[PDB]
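$ run holo --ligand "iron/sulfur cluster" --emit tokens
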Amino acid sequence: GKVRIGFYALTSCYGCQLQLAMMDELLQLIPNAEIVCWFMIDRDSIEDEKVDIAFIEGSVSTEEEVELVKKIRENAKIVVAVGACAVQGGVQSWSEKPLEELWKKVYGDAKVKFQPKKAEPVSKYIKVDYNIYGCPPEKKDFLYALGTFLIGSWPEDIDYPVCLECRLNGHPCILLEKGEPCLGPVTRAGCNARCPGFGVACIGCRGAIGYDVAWFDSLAKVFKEKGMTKEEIIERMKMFNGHDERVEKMVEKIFS
Amino acid sequence: YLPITIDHIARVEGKGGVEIIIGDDGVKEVKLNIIEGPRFFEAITIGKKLEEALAIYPRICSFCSAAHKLTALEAAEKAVGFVPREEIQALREVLYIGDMIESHALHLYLLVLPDYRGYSSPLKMVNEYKREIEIALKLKNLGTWMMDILGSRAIHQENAVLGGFGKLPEKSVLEKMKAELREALPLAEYTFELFAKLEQYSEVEGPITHLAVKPRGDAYGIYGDYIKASDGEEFPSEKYRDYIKEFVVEHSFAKHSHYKGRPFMVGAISRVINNADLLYGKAKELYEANKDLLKGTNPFANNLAQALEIVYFIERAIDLLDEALAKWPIKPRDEVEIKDGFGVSTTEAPRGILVYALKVENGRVSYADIITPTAFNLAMMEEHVRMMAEKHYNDDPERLKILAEMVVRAYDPCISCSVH
Ligand code: SF4
Ligand code: SF4
Ligand code: SF4
Ligand code: FCO
Ligand code: NI
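-- output --
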């Protein structure tokens, strides 16, 4: 009896798997366990093994991926959504463009035996029990859930914005001082504020959090003297959170 | 009506399969079915502002984020008329070389070698071949580290921006790098001599058409303005449509491609066959002593050409960090007037040629055309599997299903790239 972990895959850049892959003592890092299905790494992998942990990565973009996510919800006591493509539908959700106008704008009228669908989180069809965030997640975010899950416990989610860690590091607001639209005050954290800390704006990759605490003195004031309109913030929050229905009124608290 | 279906190919990037059709004559058709959902990176970005569409192209594929993103870059910058500052390209070439060093070393060591050693998983020869895998992660993590220094990351680099970089590092780091590169060249040296002793199978030898960007200066490189083909032809990188054409088939979400109405192969042998003489350093001598192994006549010589290039690209970024360091201190980025225009770039991605073609009108993206290297390759891939399927079909199926795949895994297919 060694805890069963499979790593299954949907529609992705496999960065979230790449991330687990390039962690180097990884098998010293999950010993009370066994890897049963990770096709990128094991050819001895089978999909219809009953597993204990189910790291599902990617969007549901083809119909048979509706068959897979239901398939794995059944052979798994825990289905963990890994990365923004599986947590949020990703960057393939930031257009509401119907599938067919997207088929025509790329394929014209040329049929593929396989059924494509608009992008959707894993949550739509099957129950997600936990969420590892980031595009891709941080090594420290994979260390946490695997190790905690494997001593028997349950993981939890950092509910504070990127701006807290941002400030910790001594990082100067590239928002206040430089006019870049940072999605840092509305993005869950964990990245050690990587993008402020490169003179770059937070682009949202770790997911939407809500702005229910007054971290900035007046973000509306900053957004009304940088020239950042509520619609702007929305197009940008939508690049990794285009299925959040909460966006439209979260940015509206900020300007109210 | 009694097929060989390999529902999934192991140790490649992406969701795909095979349907090898057996008849009574032998082998009818070979079908690589590719099921990785389109993500319509060519359309969802349309009507979106350039910067915003640009931080999104690298999420096509984690084995080649730098490539996509640094290519997106060059084509948005021919579009808006910008030109890179000189030490700022050298750094972009450097960042591309840690995408390259790592990709190969991850494909070769953790995807290819397991088949020639007996192992299903690379997570397995861990206490049986310890030194290789310690050689493995050393090359890979000079890779992984380089990208984490000049691009915030290995998967999707947010520091490389329009105009250059958002924070270049302290000088000492480009020196320590050059110090870690010099402590790597013996590691790729080992990897040459390992993958050359390996089998480039006979059931695949046969004539192939080999296409490659042509290096825009004196040396083997990545960037350049002229696609070359192995016949002895050359054509402007801006007319890739007017010289290569796409077509949809029902058996894949990825298009297929012809040069001269027939299959061709991009992806590192293609570069050695086409631009071998532009090399120097330990790599020139390794090609000029091991060439009956680096012929355009066998798929699997893709694997050993990778090993050779880790020799080249290690040494060239040594010189290229040196070139950058002669303009120090360097301003990170310069300002880019986003004016309207069109731009095509062709670069050598880890696997062959990546074309980005960008149109922007009024700050936003009105058009885009991407073709990635695995998509270019899908169609000679299928023929080279057929060729193996020919000489092995009435075998124990599981004796067959291993060797076709190795062939697949000899292109380093990257299916999240062939479907975008
Ligand atoms: S979340 Fe990002 S890194 Fe992870 S699979 Fe999706 S696109 Fe790739
Ligand atoms: S740069 Fe962005 S994350 Fe950092 S303090 Fe400013 S708003 Fe917050
Ligand atoms: S700063 Fe934002 S976009 Fe950048 S890594 Fe962190 S969560 Fe992702
Ligand atoms: N190498 C690589 Fe990815 C593909 N195909 C790109 O570009
Ligand atoms: Ni790729």
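-- notes --
The pocket of iron/sulfur cluster (ligand 2) is lined by residues A 162-163, 166-167, 171, 173-175, 182, 184-185, 193, 196, 202 (CB under 6 Å).
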